[PDB]
Amino acid sequence: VGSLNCIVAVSQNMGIGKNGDLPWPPLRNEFRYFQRMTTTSSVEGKQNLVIMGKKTWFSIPEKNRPLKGRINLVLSRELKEPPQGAHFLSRSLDDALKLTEQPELANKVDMVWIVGGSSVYKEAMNHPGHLKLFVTRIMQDFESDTFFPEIDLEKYKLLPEYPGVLSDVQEEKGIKYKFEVYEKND
Ligand SMILES: NC(=O)C1=CN([C@@H]2O[C@H](COP(=O)(O)OP(=O)(O)OC[C@H]3O[C@@H](n4cnc5c(N)ncnc54)[C@H](OP(=O)(O)O)[C@@H]3O)[C@@H](O)[C@H]2O)C=CC1
Ligand SMILES: CN(c1ccc(OC(F)(F)F)cc1)c1ccc2nc(N)nc(N)c2n1
């Protein structure tokens, strides 16, 4: 394993989802950023693993599942096999992270990316160890029914810079947004 990361886009009121989709209209360059960050692996011959909950998997349009060029793992205690198109299934986050140590993954996985939803983020964010959060701040309030867990700034430090992460305010479809990276080591 090459490390543990969360990536999310969040409104000003901490919203991430509404009725099975994002709260805001599609931001193409935000999606392009998500796909680049999650897919890009520096270790030759390895790929990244994306871990997501069951509702997040079904929120991706079927033509775009699995997320291409990544190993897709879904968390569910109800499902008996990965949902159709997905690669692995785990009943907990610890199980998923143990799975990466097993022979079928131990030499394949470079970065692990938690791509949502809320319960997955909350647990990962309180997981010991070095962890980065890649947060897109959507700089407006949007009505939401799913929210990002609190970021404890006593442990997570906002970085001044990060390679491959544009620093400046961005705007698509009249909506301003900014890419941030946070890091903890505990
Ligand atoms: N803005 C963004 O960056 C993102 C937005 N989204 C949006 O967020 C919403 C989906 O989020 P949310 O409702 O939080 O759903 P999740 O994706 O977290 O799905 C929840 C289901 O996942 C399973 N689950 C979650 N955590 C675990 C776990 N730790 N161990 C075992 N199973 C687990 C359970 O399945 P079971 O009941 O089968 O046990 C649970 O019912 C959607 O609206 C989606 O569009 C999603 C990701 C990112
Ligand atoms: C929910 N999800 C998602 C939804 C739909 C998709 O279909 C596709 F790929 F566009 F075809 C792909 C990814 C997203 C979408 C944008 C996201 N942004 C950031 N910064 N962080 C996340 N975790 C996130 N996750």
Q: Where are the domains of the chain?
A: 1-186
- Experimental technique, in short, is X-ray
* Rounded CA separation 49/114 (Å): 8
CA distance 151 to 145: 18
Catalytic residues: 22, 30
Q: How many CA atoms lie within 13 A of 30 on its CB side?
A: 26
Pair of tokens at residue 61: 């349009």
Secondary structure element (H or E) that encloses residue 158, with its range: strand 157-158
CA 75 – ligand 1 centroid, Å? 8
DSSP helix/strand/coil, 32: helix
CATH homologous superfamily of 1-186 equals Dihydrofolate Reductase, subunit A (3.40.430.10)
Q: Which ligand does the CA of 64 lie closest to?
A: 2
21 lines ligand 1 (CB under 6 A): yes
| Resolution attained, angstroms | 1.5
